[PDB]
Amino acid sequence: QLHLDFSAKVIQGSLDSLPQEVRKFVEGNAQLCQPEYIHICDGSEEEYGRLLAHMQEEGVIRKLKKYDNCWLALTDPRDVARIESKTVIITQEQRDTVPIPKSGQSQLGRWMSEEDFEKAFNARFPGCMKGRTMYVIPFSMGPLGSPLAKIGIELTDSPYVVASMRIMTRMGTSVLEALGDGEFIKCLHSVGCPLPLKKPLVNNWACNPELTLIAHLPDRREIISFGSGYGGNSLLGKKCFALRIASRLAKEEGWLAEHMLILGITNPEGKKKYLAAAFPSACGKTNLAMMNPTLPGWKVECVGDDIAWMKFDAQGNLRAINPENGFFGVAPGTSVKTNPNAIKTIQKNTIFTNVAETSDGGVYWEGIDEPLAPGVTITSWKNKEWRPQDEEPCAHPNSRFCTPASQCPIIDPAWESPEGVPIEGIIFGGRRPAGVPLVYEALSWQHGVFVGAAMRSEGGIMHDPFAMRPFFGYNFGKYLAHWLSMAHRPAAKLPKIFHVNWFRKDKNGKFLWPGFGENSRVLEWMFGRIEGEDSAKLTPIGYVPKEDALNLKGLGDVNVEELFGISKEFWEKEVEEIDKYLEDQVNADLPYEIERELRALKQRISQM
Ligand SMILES: Nc1nc2c(ncn2[C@@H]2O[C@H](COP(=O)(O)OP(=O)(O)OP(=O)(O)O)[C@@H](O)[C@H]2O)c(=O)[nH]1
Numbered sequence: 358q359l360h361l362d363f364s365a366k367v368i369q370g371s372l373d374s375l376p377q378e379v380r381k382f383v384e385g386n387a388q389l390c391q392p393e394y395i396h397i398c399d400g401s402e403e404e405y406g407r408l409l410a411h412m413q414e415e416g417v418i419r420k421l422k423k424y425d426n427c428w429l430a431l432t433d434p435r436d437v438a439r440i441e442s443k444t445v446i447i448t449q450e451q452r453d454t455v456p457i458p459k460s461g462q463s464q465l466g467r468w469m470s471e472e473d474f475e476k477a478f479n480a481r482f483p484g485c486m487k488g489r490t491m492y493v494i495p496f497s498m499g500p501l502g503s504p505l506a507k508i509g510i511e512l513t514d515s516p517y518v519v520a521s522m523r524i525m526t527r528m529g530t531s532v533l534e535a536l537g538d539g540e541f542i543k544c545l546h547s548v549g550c551p552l553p554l555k556k557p558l559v560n561n562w563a564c565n566p567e568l569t570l571i572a573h574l575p576d577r578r579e580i581i582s583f584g585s586g587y588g589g590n591s592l593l594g595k596k597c598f599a600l601r602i603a604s605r606l607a608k609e610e611g612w613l614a615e616h617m618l619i620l621g622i623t624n625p626e627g628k629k630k631y632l633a634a635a636f637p638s639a640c641g642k643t644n645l646a647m648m649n650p651t652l653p654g655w656k657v658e659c660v661g662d663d664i665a666w667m668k669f670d671a672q673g674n675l676r677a678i679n680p681e682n683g684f685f686g687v688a689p690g691t692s693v694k695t696n697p698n699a700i701k702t703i704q705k706n707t708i709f710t711n712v713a714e715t716s717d718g719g720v721y722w723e724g725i726d727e728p729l730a731p732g733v734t735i736t737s738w739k740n741k742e743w744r745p746q747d748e749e750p751c752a753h754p755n756s757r758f759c760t761p762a763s764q765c766p767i768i769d770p771a772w773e774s775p776e777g778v779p780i781e782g783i784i785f786g787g788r789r790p791a792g793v794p795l796v797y798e799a800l801s802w803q804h805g806v807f808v809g810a811a812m813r814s815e816g817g818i819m820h821d822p823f824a825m826r827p828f829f830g831y832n833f834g835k836y837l838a839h840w841l842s843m844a845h846r847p848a849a850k851l852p853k854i855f856h857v858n859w860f861r862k863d864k865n866g867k868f869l870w871p872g873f874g875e876n877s878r879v880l881e882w883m884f885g886r887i888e889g890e891d892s893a894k895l896t897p898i899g900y901v902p903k904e905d906a907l908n909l910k911g912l913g914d915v916n917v918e919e920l921f922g923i924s925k926e927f928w929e930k931e932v933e934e935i936d937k938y939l940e941d942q943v944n945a946d947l948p949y950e951i952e953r954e955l956r957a958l959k960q961r962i963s964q965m
Pocket residue numbers: 636637638639640641642643644645663685686687690695859860868871872873876
């Protein structure tokens with residue numbers, strides 16, 4: 358050059374050390390964003406402890422004195438969740454990203470043109486890191502060096518993101534060494550608050566709500582996120598990369614990237630199988646992935662609780678890996694009763710966001726179901742004193758823990774095996790207060806994809822097909838076609854597909870099923886069905902357990918008639934509702950097989 362060599366500003370590592378393409382990505386975005394310092398993360402314990410202690414000294418995080426190396430971050434309340442309306446995918450044509458709805462608004466993604474995004478980018482990123490450190494985070498999604506793993510580089514101006522990525526991905530120098538001159542996903546993040554601050558800082562939490570924009574450019578292998586320091590907006594490996602970018606990659610390359618837990622279940626005979634399950638956010642993946650089974654002699658072990666990458670191997674087994682390195686789990690509702698294994702995992706080396714703090718340096722949230730000693734007081738996530746009779750919760754309803762996977766006492770022994778675990782069943786499920794029984798089994802692969810397409814969240818109202826509504830990297834119609842195509846992969850060992858419903862209520866709004874560890878009784882049935890056991894009765898919706906097939910010992914107060922009932926009237930409405938939805942939201946891009954399954958279901962219900 359005659360006068361972008363950023364070597365003078367490197368305060369950890371060396372630009373000369375980086376693979377050539379990594380250096381180009383770092384230096385191009387350094388020129389653009391103008392950070393004061395560049396810190397190439399090494400992923401070391403030393404780095405991490407120093408970063409936490411720094412954040413602590415600035416008032417960005419607090420140490421939770423009751424626990425071993427745990428920390429609390431309280432955000433600006435404007436920055437507390439994924440913002441779906443500010444989350445977009447850029448492609449040349451809108452239809453490649455989302456189907457064109459008849460109601461002029463898609464529920465299945467949000468497209469932005471290249472032109473509009475270029476303008477948005479130029480209005481945000483120039484100079485956005487002034488006065489700050491640009492951290493360079495080399496990370497692997499999946500076990501380091503696994504043939505199913507994929508590497509990214511995230512640039513960020515947030516120490517909180519660096520700490521959380523260290524938990525949620527594999528990151529540091531070993532990733533750079535593994536990468537060499539290979540391809541990587543380019544991830545660029547800024548809290549959007551260059552120094553000197555143009556607006557006041559709220560709760561020591563840098564963010565720019567008005568300019569928040571989480572963009573995905575699958576054709577350029579780029580994720581570009583501005584304005585939010587929170588969770589799925591800032592930890593780019595998780596939703597942005599491992600669902601949105603990865604699902605489109607998966608479609609091109611013949612595999613699947615899904616919003617699924619992966620678990621290993623062992624029966625009293627010592628026989629083990631792996632299952633994957635897609636439930637929408639707020640519908641209990643993490644509880645099932647970590648289940649403490651109530652049934653004696655059974656064991657559940659966790660491979661992952663949120664994302665699965667699955668690819669058929671040479672023998673036709675559908676192999677799954679967890680591309681994450683930790684659990685970014687919802688804190689409220691987590692108790693010894695609902696998730697005892699999570700309670701164990703999170704007492705050390707854990708970062709909590711937006712939960713309450715007790716006066717002895719512990720954590721608190723709605724549904725923790727753990728009384729405090731008299732005199733122990735509570736500071737809410739809004740940093741105000743709080744009492745249990747107050748109108749507001751003590752913790753944000755989407756507050757999280759961020760905890761290392763390897764600490765889970767029931768972590769699966771194969772949770773990092775590079776070839777992945779063989780999936781034998783896929784479970785769909787949602788919140789259905791009425792009509793849908795506790796468990797049913799799909800009649801075929803094509804029926805099972807239809808059943809995934811029919812999933813619901815939020816009290817049985819919102820459609821959330823495959824638990825992917827906020828996460829599709831491309832047109833949902835085409836994703837259906839991709840799933841259906843698996844039936845035609847020669848010698849594929851197609852998993853059995855089930856649908857569960859933990860959430861059926863009686864007329865008074867009481868749950869008909871106790872759930873949590875009692876769900877082990879449902880898993881027992883699925884396990885027997887995969888083994889070929891004659892434990893199923895055919896019904897218009899699929900197979901259900903025979904009378905006496907489920908182990909209900911210890912649960913004699915269960916209303917079996919209501920929990921397992923199938924009403925013609927309910928199912929007529931359901932098929933009409935599904936028809937309207939698929940027409941409104943998918944229309945021209947709906948695969949014929951999905952249409953055929955809808956007709957087949959309608960026809961079976963007509964014969965009741
Ligand atoms: N009634 C009942 N509720 C359950 C069961 N399992 C989980 N839940 C509820 O599920 C909610 C917690 O699920 P989340 O951790 O939000 O769900 P998730 O699928 O892990 O979501 P993300 O982490 O956002 O993907 C709480 O309201 C729990 O009470 C069950 O067996 N029965």
